[PDB]
């Protein structure tokens, strides 16, 4: 499988995967058989925060970060609206003194940033359960490979 395939389920449409800058693996923005997206689930379990989009995605290769202060924590970044997007921390950078919407809603990235894989594309994937993800992330500490 390509080097940018979801380490959980194998999805590799470049508009669908996200690079975790810390663990140095890729993950998709589909839910599969879980209640959240694979990438978000990964970020919560491994306690990471900084991601990079894929170059052949709609926005190209891009480390997500705040326009104002340069924070790279996806759990703090957001946007406010014609065709340009400025990313901003909720606090302080998006405060009244400095309609805001987080990039992570319903435990996945917004679909215009990273596309949600289709029901069709998630069925043709390596089926994996929430228990199994929890299991596998646990092992990844000693042998990440």
């Amino acid at each position: 499988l390509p080097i940018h395939a979801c380490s959980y389920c194998g999805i590799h449409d470049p508009a669908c995967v996200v690079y975790c800058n810390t663990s140095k693996k890729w993950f998709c923005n589909g839910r599969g058989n879980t209640s959240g997206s694979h990438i978000v689930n990964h970020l919560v379990r491994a306690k990471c925060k900084e991601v990079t989009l894929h170059k052949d995605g709609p926005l190209g290769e891009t480390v997500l970060e705040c326009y104002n202060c340069g924070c790279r924590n996806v759990f703090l970044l957001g946007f406010i609206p014609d065709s340009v997007v400025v990313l901003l921390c909720r606090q302080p950078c998006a405060s009244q003194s400095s309609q805001w919407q987080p990039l992570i809603q319903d435990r996945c990235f917004l679909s215009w940033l990273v596309k949600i894989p289709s029901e069709q594309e998630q069925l043709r994937a390596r089926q994996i359960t929430a228990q199994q993800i929890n299991k596998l992330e646990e092992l990844w500490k000693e042998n990440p490979s």
Partner: peptide, 8 residues
């Protein structure tokens, strides 16, 4: 660095 140009 914080700026995203939407595809169309």
């Amino acid at each position: 660095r914080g700026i995203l140009i939407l595809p169309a």
